[PDB]
Design a protein around this ligand. Structure first.
Ligand SMILES: [Cl-]
Ligand SMILES: [Mg+2]
Ligand SMILES: [Mg+2]
Lengths: 241, 240, 235, 250, 231, 111, 244, 195, 243
């Protein structure tokens, strides 16, 4: 039974190492959520600092890949940082070679192709991560593109990743079924972040303090992460209505 | 590159891959070599399971390495082509760098060295081939007959056989071949070579190939009718 | 399966230990060192009477002052001999002198452990390297596939080795002559050999300071065999 | 490091079977149904857009892909394997043909190049075969319209019409009854939609179906005017609206 | 068991069995003792023979004028590692006109051995080394294990029955460290130390091997009748 | 253009006696018309009772001597502390010089 | 490390056989039968396509018979994809020879070259062999008309008549019975089709299940012509010989 | 080296090549054979830069002999000439080209025809009834243009060749020390020992 | 089963058992700690005295990278040295190209990526060490701890080896009782205490204390070993607290 150790086909036509890489994705026990506004793309993720000896400022699963592209990862941090470093290098090389900023969907495809190679070549293992890329693309507008260990990728109106992804997914599905539009009809990104947090609270059924969350925001020509005090201001506005 | 060690020692001190290569030689068609006083004859078996064969174009069992040296074999046919090609290249390479054709002993030592190299190199299996190399050294009238095998050892023989049922024909040669007085003529040498193959071959029709090599690059292959005359004369004397 | 360079739980390299078993199956080779020279002798062991025994070359010249006998998978020795001859003559090129027997032996033994996954396996042959130099005089070395080499006053390798080594234990002394050593090799070879010893199935050789390395003729060895028979019948 | 898998991962078993190719074909069988039909004046290729989530934008995932202006492709099996094959197929059409002869390759030769790539993944060291079967439709001046299937082994066959994947056995039977040598392109599209409806469970509309054609030259899609000989691509992907219009006359 | 097939595999308890098996080869090897004072450093080695006709395998190797070692285990591996030390000592002299520090020599051996324990295909070294030397910070003694671990010591011993000599040195610690400016007395302490590891056999003229290095003493090896003085 | 060679002047003299030998050389080191040093040793004791001097381009001269001293050291390691004879040293030095046949050590050497 | 997963494709069995070559031959025995018959005035190549479909485009299809150059052609039995790799190599080799010597490559030299490539995969590299057996039909001015076969072992032999693929045992017996040395092309065409018709696993032998080709000096004066038969032409020769 | 001539008559090819070898201002040898037998019915003469000539000729010889053994068959003069041309055309764009000019005289046993090929160091091949390299043609071609017929006998070919050598000996400033003449026909290659 | 026999193989859990077995080698090693202070960091390690023959203060375990970074580790010592050698190459190439000395977070990722790379293939073994490291850069003090998996985080206090639980408990008390912060000289004293308290898990053999530190005020932001009177003062403070 060596067909379960390396990335070759089983008699059922399956790749067990890819399937087990998907299971490593939930090892951190963290849930992430991504939504699109009119002018922005917001990504939120649970932040859990169990040890008091940890420096909480260094605990993060959100990455600034380029000025325009942000990435949240679902999976162990070593593989997350492996993917982050590669995506940063690819984004920079793209700009140098082709004279314009690498689009979010193109980077997603590139990282998805690299992941495909690990599913076909035996010596390389799959990375046990799911990569959610976000930006406000200059051609396509607000964009969410997500990659997995199978080498699969697709664009999203909104998305969720983690152990409780289904609960969040259905919550978002039901909202877009009402509004009948592909985004959050809101002017400011502040209110889009408030929407994201509110709907994660409703879906998971847990309250959040400023240190329990981690937020990334993509606007035209820049992606940035929010500080704890920026998140606190967001939580106050939610509670006051 | 593929570096896997395929030929390795076993607890009892054997290299099984080299020994299994000898089993491939055992499966191969019988080849025999007999040296007379002024010649060497190479006999070869052709299995008659394959009829409808085109004997004009089918690869002959005996191969010229140079104008004065020949090589026959037993074992895997495809493997033998690689050794023959290498041997032919080395023969021309020797003429080019030393201005003399190879001696039969030198050519044998080279081929044996190639076989040995394939028993302790990574990512390769041994040649499933044993060879009989015969000829005459330049400006020399003493006959030469050598044998090689997959392990890479080689040695000189007054007469020798290899391949399937070689045990039987070697038995015949050991009692029939006299060292003090070897086959004085070409006839006697060919007759003894045909007789030895008739112990094993089955039918004496197109199953026996004979190649006579004489001094000074005089190499000829006997035809079916010429061999058939030897087959006829042997059995007529036997009916007594 | 398993690595080629793997250690056993006892702390030995499996492949090196297995190659030693192949050497035990080889034909007997004996070496005896004296102050008048070093004698090397081997069992030829022809597999058939049609095999021309003089073509069996198990004793070999490395240089004028160094000889070599082999036992085991003798085909593996050819590349070792080629390296030894090259090393011996190359040193003569670089330093305008003969190379020390120990230094030559060390050069051969450096090849031994160059195997892995370089060649794919260790050598399956042991060598008795005999020679003479001005510094250490007449010397006899035993080169193994482990990369180890021991100097010996007398040594036997091959199938009848432990029986021959016990005999060499009793017979060897520091005042042996060359003639005495020759007869002693023949005596012990005759003892361990399956077939009856004669000039055709056994070979002698020696290395002296004056005449260098010499392989003995079959006529010369035949007389030494006849001389042996008479002296054994003398008591 | 170094790729130390320099040996084949696909090997013959005692029965003569190449296991990894067979298992790759099993993966293709599990894949979503896709089909191709050849008409007198065109070719059609179609498949279902099996969306993994309703939140996912299925327009961004293209199962039917342009390889050259006159050649298109669709698949059944593992999507990521298909995506990289399309990248390689597009590139090999340039490197091994267009940069030499100054024109795009004919369908059969591009198929031959793709087939070669898939064969090498079946014999080369340290790789598994591609887990896809491709249907490649195309047109060229001297061979006219053509449709080819390519399997994980690297074997390829020309078809008048065929289907691969989930419900291929039933779909091929359906096509045998409907196909003739006098079909016009619109008739082939109609048959393609009928055949594809049998294998689809849920919604059946322009947003859940992906369909493209190889047909007449499209000068409106060329992007420039002034060169008479350049008349535009024959490959065209049908829009969501264009599919729905033909579903009313179904 | 299932985790000893190669050097690249940890066992479930975090052990590297191929390295431990390489360590076992040292225990089978003949005993060798190392010790030092503030002025000199001494190696003492019990050489082993194959039989009565054979010579006694050399145990001590010179690396530079100020440095050398003794071996226990696979002798060819010692030749490889000593050759590496010879080159490194020599690189330091040619490039920096600087005698190689004994501590740095130990760090280089550690790193060379380590690479063989983490990579596939290769094997660990099957030999233990005792390195002595005299540099700018005085006399030094190092113990090398093929796991990579190198340790600076006042005295030690490795090989078969080495525990006896190691205990003796542990008692004599305060005495032999003070033997300054007296090479013969320091060697005596080493010969007396290695004698605690002997059974049946005793120290003969062609059995014993001694080496010494110090303040105004280059690394020199004593064999044959040169060590009869200490028997 | 860069000229990798230079001339440091100096002169050396070797004379062989019946049971002795001398190797002499001046201690002046120069470039063009300037003096670099009035005392820069040029003749060296290389061990094994051999003396050596590489006269001409000082950088190549120092490099050769350094390499020969090294060759003596490794000759001891490789051949059981055997003394390197003068004829053996001479032949060794030939091979050191010819290793740069196409980018020569610009020195006239005497041992 | 990686050793764990290595099948070791290039090793001997205890009996002295090459595992992968033997298993490749087992694969080939399930492939469609291909037959070659050499006559005094030409060569015939006949081959059976495997269980086809009505929707297969036959006139543009090629799975059995391939052209190496103007003088030499091959019939394939085994993995088609593997065969095309080798075929393209052989086409290049023939052109290399033509460029070097300004003469068309002798048949045997081309055959030996391809057979040597197959041999290499059985002795080194650690890769699976090519699961292909060829029948070479060709002509040159030295030996005239020639038939050869090669298999995954890299061994090749010459033939007057030969079959590869499925039911070769039965097919070779039938060929050995009816073949004669003074035979002509038109007679050989009939023999090839009659042999396939009796050995086939199909219910009946039809035009759509066959590929056919001839190499004839039946070209205007001293020269050779290759004829790859079209579907309609195969249908006509089936009626002519009296099979359908 | 300097002068190499060639002429194709009715039933044979005749090659004439100078005997001189010069080094500095001294003629080291006056009996040098500037030719190699490539096969029993194919002869190649050569001229060019010192050392390169023999190395190239022997390399070609080795390749043709290798081919002969492998196939047990003699290549046609046309096939050999094409092989030689390709090697020279390959050589001219190398780091250090081989500066060798050759004439290939062979008898084709299949067509029963003599054949003469002229190939220069660039790889410029031409089939000719008569040919030369370097300055040799400047003196001799006018005689050959006048006297040559395709139905000439071997003896008439030798007489016309003598006239060419006599003209060279008269009008060249160079002493080439006479020529070695060799004939290539159906029976093989032989040397004319008196010329 | 068989998933634990080869590195880089995911088990059905989604775990790399070979990396988890490497952690067992770390847990077997001696105790090492790190303490982040007001303007720098302090490192300390337990050195087991196996024998009286060990020369005191000679077998140094703590290693410097560049001139501003300190590294200490528990587990297989050679593996740690290999990792530090790489770290030094990474720090050198960074300074070569960018001029400024490598920032601590930047340096942390360089090690992290290198250790993570040794979990991607079966042709290499994972690192058998957990490494505590850090120092002072332009943005202030940083302390990191890096595991065999390649996982690392920033820390206020860090501990690894056989006595890690005891150490962690002591570190947690300091964080609670000093929210405003801890001074560099205090951290050296506390580091000594914690190693002594953690030595109860290795109480069979006696040990030697080794401490180092980087501080903006006390060492000018350079890595230095704690020696002489300051070391003895810390030992005395530690000995007083256990009694
Ligand atoms: Cl890509
Ligand atoms: Mg993989
Ligand atoms: Mg010309």
């Amino acid at each position: 039974g060596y067909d379960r150790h390396i990335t070759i086909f089983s008699p059922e036509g399956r790749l067990y190492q890819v399937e087990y890489a998907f299971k490593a994705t939930n090892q951190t026990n963290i849930n992430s959520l991504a939504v699109r506004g009119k002018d922005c793309t917001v990504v939120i993720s649970q932040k859990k600092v169990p040890d008091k000896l940890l420096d909480p400022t260094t605990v993060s699963y959100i990455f600034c890949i380029s000025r325009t592209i942000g990435m949240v990862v679902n999976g162990p941090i070593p593989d997350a940082r492996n993917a982050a470093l590669r995506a940063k290098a690819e984004a920079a090389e793209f700009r140098y070679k082709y004279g314009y900023d690498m689009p979010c969907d193109v980077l997603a495809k590139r990282m998805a192709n690299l992941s495909q190679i690990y599913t076909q070549r035996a010596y390389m293992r799959p990375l046990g991560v799911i990569l959610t890329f976000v930006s406000v693309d200059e051609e396509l507008g607000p964009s969410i593109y997500k990659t997995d260990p199978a080498g699969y990728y697709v664009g999203y109106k909104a998305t969720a990743t983690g152990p409780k992804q289904q609960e969040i997914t259905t919550n978002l599905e039901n909202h877009f079924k009402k509004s009948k539009i592909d985004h959050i009809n809101e002017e400011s990104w502040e209110k889009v972040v408030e929407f994201a947090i509110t709907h994660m609270i409703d879906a998971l059924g847990t309250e959040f303090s400023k240190n329990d969350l981690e937020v990334g925001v993509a606007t035209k020509d820049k992606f940035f992460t929010l500080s704890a005090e920026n998140i606190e201001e967001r939580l106050v506005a939610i509670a006051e209505q | 590159g593929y570096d896997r060690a395929l030929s390795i020692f076993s607890p009892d001190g054997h290299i099984f891959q080299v020994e299994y290569a000898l089993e491939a030689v055992k499966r191969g068609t019988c080849a025999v070599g007999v040296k007379g006083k002024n010649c060497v004859v190479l006999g070869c078996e052709r299995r008659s399971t394959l009829k409808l064969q085109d004997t004009r174009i089918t690869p002959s069992k005996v191969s010229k390495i140079d104008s004065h040296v020949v090589l026959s074999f037993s074992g895997l046919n495809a493997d033998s082509r690689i050794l023959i090609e290498k041997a032919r290249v080395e023969a021309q390479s020797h003429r080019l760098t030393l201005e003399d054709p190879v001696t039969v002993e030198y050519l044998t030592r080279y081929v044996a060295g190639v076989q040995q190299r394939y028993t302790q190199s990574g990512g390769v299996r041994p040649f499933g081939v044993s060879t009989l190399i015969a000829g005459f050294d330049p400006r020399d009238d003493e006959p030469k007959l050598y044998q090689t095998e997959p392990s890479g050892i080689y040695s000189s023989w007054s007469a020798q056989t290899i391949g399937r049922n070689s045990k039987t024909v070697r038995e015949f040669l050991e009692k029939n071949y006299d060292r003090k007085e070897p086959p004085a003529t070409v006839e006697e040498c060919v007759k003894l070579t045909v007789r030895s193959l008739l112990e094993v071959v089955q039918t004496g029709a197109k199953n026996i190939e004979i190649t006579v090599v004489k001094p000074d690059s005089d190499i000829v292959a006997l035809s079916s009718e010429e061999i058939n005359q030897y087959v006829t004369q042997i059995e007529q004397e036997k009916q007594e | 399966d398993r690595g080629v360079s793997t250690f056993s739980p006892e702390g030995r390299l499996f492949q090196v230990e297995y190659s030693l078993e192949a050497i035990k199956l080889g034909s007997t080779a004996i070496g005896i060192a004296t102050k008048e020279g070093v004698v090397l002798g081997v069992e030829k062991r022809a597999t058939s009477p049609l095999l021309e025994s003089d073509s069996i070359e198990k004793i070999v010249e490395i240089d004028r002052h160094i000889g070599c006998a082999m036992s085991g998978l003798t085909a593996d020795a050819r590349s070792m001999i080629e390296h030894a001859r090259t090393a011996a003559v190359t040193h003569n090129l670089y330093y305008d002198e003969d190379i020390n027997v120990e230094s030559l032996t060390q050069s051969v033994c450096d090849l031994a452990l160059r195997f892995g996954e370089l060649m794919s396996r260790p050598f399956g042959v042991a060598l008795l390297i005999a020679g003479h130099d001005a510094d250490d005089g007449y010397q006899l070395f035993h080169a193994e596939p482990s990369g180890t080499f021991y100097r010996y006053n007398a040594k036997a390798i091959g199938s009848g080795s432990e029986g021959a080594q016990a005999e060499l234990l009793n017979e060897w002394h520091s005042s042996l002559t060359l003639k005495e050593a020759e007869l002693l090799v023949l005596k012990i070879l005759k003892q361990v050999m399956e077939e009856k010893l004669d000039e055709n199935n056994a070979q002698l050789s020696c290395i002296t300071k004056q005449d260098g390395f010499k392989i003995y003729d079959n006529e010369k060895t035949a007389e030494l065999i006849k001389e042996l028979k008479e002296k054994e019948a003398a008591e | 490091m170094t790729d130390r898998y320099s040996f084949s991962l696909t090997t013959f078993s005692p029965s003569g079977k190449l296991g990894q190719i067979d298992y790759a074909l099993t993966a293709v069988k599990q894949g979503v149904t896709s089909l191709g039909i050849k008409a007198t004046n065109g070719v059609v290729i179609a498949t279902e857009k099996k969306s993994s989530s309703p939140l996912a934008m299925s327009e961004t995932l293209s199962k039917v892909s342009l390889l050259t202006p006159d050649i298109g492709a669709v698949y059944s099996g593992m999507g990521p394997d298909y995506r990289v094959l399309v990248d390689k197929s597009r590139k090999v059409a340039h490197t091994s043909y267009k940069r030499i002869y100054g024109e795009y390759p004919p369908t059969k030769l591009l198929v031959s190049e793709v087939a070669k790539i898939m064969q090498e993944a079946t014999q080369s060291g340290g790789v598994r075969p591609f887990g896809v079967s491709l249907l490649i439709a195309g047109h060229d001046e001297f061979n006219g319209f053509s449709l080819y299937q390519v399997d994980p082994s690297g074997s390829y066959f020309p078809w008048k019409a065929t289907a691969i994947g989930k419900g291929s056995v039933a779909a091929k039977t359906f096509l045998e009854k409907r196909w003739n040598d006098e079909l016009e392109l619109e008739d082939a599209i109609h048959i393609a939609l009928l055949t594809l409806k049998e294998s689809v469970e849920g919604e059946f509309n322009g947003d859940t179906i992906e369909l493209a054609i190889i047909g007449d030259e499209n000068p409106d899609l060329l992007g420039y005017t002034g060169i008479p000989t350049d008349k535009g691509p024959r490959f065209r992907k049908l829009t969501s609206q264009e599919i729905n219009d033909r579903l009313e006359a179904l | 068991n299932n985790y000893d097939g190669d050097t690249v595999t940890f066992s479930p308890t975090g052990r590297l069995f191929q390295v431990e098996y390489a360590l076992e080869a040292i225990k089978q090897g003949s005993v060798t003792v190392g010790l030092r004072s503030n002025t000199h450093a001494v190696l003492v080695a019990l050489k082993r023979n194959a039989d009565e006709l054979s010579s006694y395998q050399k145990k001590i190797i010179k690396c530079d004028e100020h440095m050398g070692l003794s071996l226990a285990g696979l002798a060819p591996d010692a030749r490889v590692l000593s050759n590496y030390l010879r080159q490194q000592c020599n690189y330091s002299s040619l490039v920096f006109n600087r005698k190689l520090a004994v501590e740095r020599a130990g760090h280089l051996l550690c790193d060379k051995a380590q690479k063989n324990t983490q990579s596939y295909g290769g094997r660990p070294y099957g030999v233990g080394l005792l390195i002595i030397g005299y540099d700018k910070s005085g006399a030094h003694l190092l113990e090398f294990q093929p796991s990579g671990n190198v340790t600076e010591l006042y005295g030690t011993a490795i090989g078969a029955r080495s525990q006896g000599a190691k205990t003796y040195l542990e008692r004599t610690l305060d005495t032999f460290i003070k033997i300054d400016g007296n090479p013969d007395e320091l060697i005596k302490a080493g010969v007396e130390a290695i004698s605690q590891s002997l059974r049946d056999e005793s120290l003969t003229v062609d059995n014993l091997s001694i080496a010494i290095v110090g303040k105004d003493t280059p690394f020199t090896i004593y064999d044959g009748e040169a060590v009869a003085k200490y028997i | 253009q860069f000229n990798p060679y230079g001339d440091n002047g100096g002169t050396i003299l070797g004379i062989a006696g019946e049971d002795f030998a001398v190797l002499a050389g001046d201690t002046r080191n120069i470039t063009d018309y300037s003096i670099n040093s009035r005392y820069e040793p040029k003749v060296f004791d290389c061990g094994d009772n051999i003396v050596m001097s590489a006269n001409g381009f000082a950088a190549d001269g120092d490099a050769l001597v350094k390499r020969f001293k090294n060759s003596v050291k490794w000759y001891h390691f490789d051949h059981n502390d055997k003394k390197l004879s003068i004829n053996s040293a001479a032949r060794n030095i030939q091979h050191l010089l010819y290793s740069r046949r196409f980018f020569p050590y610009y020195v006239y050497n005497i041992i | 490390g990686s050793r764990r997963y290595d099948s070791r494709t290039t090793i001997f069995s205890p009996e002295g056989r090459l595992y992968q070559v033997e298993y490749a031959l087992e694969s080939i025995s399930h492939a469609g039968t291909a037959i070659g018959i050499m006559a005094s005035d030409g060569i015939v190549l006949a081959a059976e396509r495997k269980v086809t479909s009505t929707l297969l485009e036959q006139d543009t299809s090629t799975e059995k018979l391939y052209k190496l150059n103007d003088k030499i052609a091959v019939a394939v039995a085994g993995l088609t994809a593997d065969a095309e790799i080798l075929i393209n190599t052989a086409r290049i080799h023939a052109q290399n020879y033509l460029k070097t010597y300004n003469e068309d490559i002798p048949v045997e030299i081309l055959v030996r070259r391809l057979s040597d490539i197959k041999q290499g995969y059985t002795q080194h590299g650690g890769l699976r062999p090519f699961g292909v057996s060829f029948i070479y039909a060709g002509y040159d001015d030295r030996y005239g008309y020639q038939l050869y076969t090669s298999n995954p072992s890299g061994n090749y032999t010459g033939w007057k008549a030969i079959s590869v693929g499925a039911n070769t045992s039965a097919a070779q017996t039938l060929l050995q019975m009816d073949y004669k040395d003074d035979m002509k092309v038109d007679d050989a065409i009939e023999l090839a089709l009659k042999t396939l018709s009796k050995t086939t696993d199909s219910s009946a032998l039809t035009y759509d299940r066959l590929e056919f080709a001839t190499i004839r000096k039946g070209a205007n004066d001293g020269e050779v012509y290759q004829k790859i038969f079209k579907p309609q032409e195969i249908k006509d020769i089936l009626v002519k010989t009296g099979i359908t | 080296m300097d002068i190499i001539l060639g002429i194709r008559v009715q039933d044979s090819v005749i090659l004439a090549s100078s005997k001189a070898v010069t080094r500095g201002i001294s003629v080291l040898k006056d009996s040098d054979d500037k030719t190699r037998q490539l096969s029993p019915h194919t002869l190649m003469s050569f001229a060019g830069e010192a050392g390169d000539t023999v190395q190239f000729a022997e390399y070609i010889q080795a390749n043709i002999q290798l081919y002969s053994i492998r196939e047990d068959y003699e290549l046609s003069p046309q096939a050999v000439s094409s092989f030689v041309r390709q090697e020279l055309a390959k050589s001219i764009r190398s780091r250090r080209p081989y500066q060798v000019n050759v004439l290939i005289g062979g008898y084709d046993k299949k067509k029963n025809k003599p054949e003469l090929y002229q190939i220069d160091y660039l790889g410029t091949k031409v089939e000719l009834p008569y040919g030369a390299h370097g300055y040799s043609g400047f003196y001799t071609f006018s005689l050959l243009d006048h006297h040559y017929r395709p139905d000439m006998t071997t003896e008439e070919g030798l007489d016309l060749l003598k006239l060419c050598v006599q003209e060279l000996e008269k009008r060249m400033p160079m002493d080439f020390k006479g020529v070695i003449v060799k004939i290539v026909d159906k029976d093989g290659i032989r040397q004319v020992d008196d010329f | 089963t068989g998933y634990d026999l080869s590195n880089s193989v995911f088990s059905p859990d989604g775990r790399n058992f070979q990396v988890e077995y490497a952690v067992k080698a770390v847990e077997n090693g001696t105790t090492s700690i790190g303490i982040k202070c007001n303007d720098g960091v302090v490192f300390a390690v337990e050195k087991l005295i196996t024998s009286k023959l060990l020369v005191p203060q000679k077998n140094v375990k703590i290693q410097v990278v560049d001139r501003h970074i300190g590294c200490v580790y528990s587990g297989l010592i050679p593996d740690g040295r290999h990792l530090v050698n790489r770290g030094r190459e990474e720090a050198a190439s960074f300074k070569k190209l960018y001029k400024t000395p490598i920032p601590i977070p930047a340096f942390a990722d360089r090690l992290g990526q290198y250790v993570q790379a040794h979990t991607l293939y079966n042709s290499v073994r994972p690192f058998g060490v957990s490494t505590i490291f850090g120092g002072v850069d332009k943005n202030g003090a940083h302390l990191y701890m890096l595991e065999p998996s390649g996982s690392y985080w920033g820390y206020k206090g860090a501990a690894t080896g056989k006595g890690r639980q005891s150490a962690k408990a002591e570190l947690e008390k300091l964080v609670d009782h000093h929210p405003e912060g801890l001074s560099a000289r205090e951290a050296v004293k506390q580091a000594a205490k914690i190693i002594y308290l953690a030595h109860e898990d290795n109480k069979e053999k006696d040990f030697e204390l080794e401490i180092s530190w980087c501080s903006l005020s006390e060492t000018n932001g350079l890595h230095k070993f704690v020696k002489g009177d300051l070391l003895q003062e810390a030992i005395d403070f530690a000995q007083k607290e256990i009694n």
